[PDB]
Design a protein around this nucleic acid. Structure first.
Length: 86
DNA sequence: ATCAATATCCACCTGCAGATTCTACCAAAAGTGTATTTGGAAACTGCTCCATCAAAAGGCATGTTCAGCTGGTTCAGCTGAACATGCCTTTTGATGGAGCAGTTTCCAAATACACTTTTGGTAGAATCTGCAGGTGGATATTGAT
């Protein structure tokens, strides 16, 4: 009963699907400098991976979603006819 | 190598045309204050830039062949720099006096500025045709012979 979603708005949002109903009465919001191509949870559940379109990877933790633990810089640049990277 | 001839740089050095100093003004720089005008930080919309992967068309890196150009040599003219000489167009240096550069007066001719009223020049949606492209064949052009 917590959810993750990613968007071209340069933000990635963590929801609580049972509690929220109010059109962005969300739980947490993490910003970025560029768009996001993927936001995938762990198997254990405590580590969120996030992957942008220009050059970055971020790891956010269970503990205080806002601040990141670590950045893994690596270029996976976006392109029209290319399949986006995950 | 050397030594005579001409041209060139360098120490002494002086009176003055050009450089600098100095008065006395007033036509430009700032202050104060105000009225007017802007460039750049938030929203939003619609072209069109980032530069992968198959499939295919056509251009180039390589190698091969040889004729005709480069660029070196030798040389018969020829022509243009040096120069003396005279003399004669210009250099300084004055003097006149006519008239254009330039200034001032002022107002008749030409224009901004602010408003209202036409209007045609410009997107966008329906029609056209000259030329891209194709097809094909006669004559002009290179070149072997």
């Amino acid at each position: 009963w917590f959810l993750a979603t990613a968007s071209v708005d340069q933000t990635v949002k963590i929801w609580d699907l049972r509690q929220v109903r109010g059109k962005a009465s969300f739980l947490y919001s993490l910003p970025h400098r560029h768009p996001v191509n993927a936001a995938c949870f762990s198997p254990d559940g405590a580590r969120l991976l996030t992957t942008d379109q220009k050059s970055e990877i971020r790891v956010y933790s269970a503990s205080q979603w806002d601040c990141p633990l670590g950045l893994i810089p690596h270029p996976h640049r976006h392109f029209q006819h290319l399949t986006p990277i995950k």
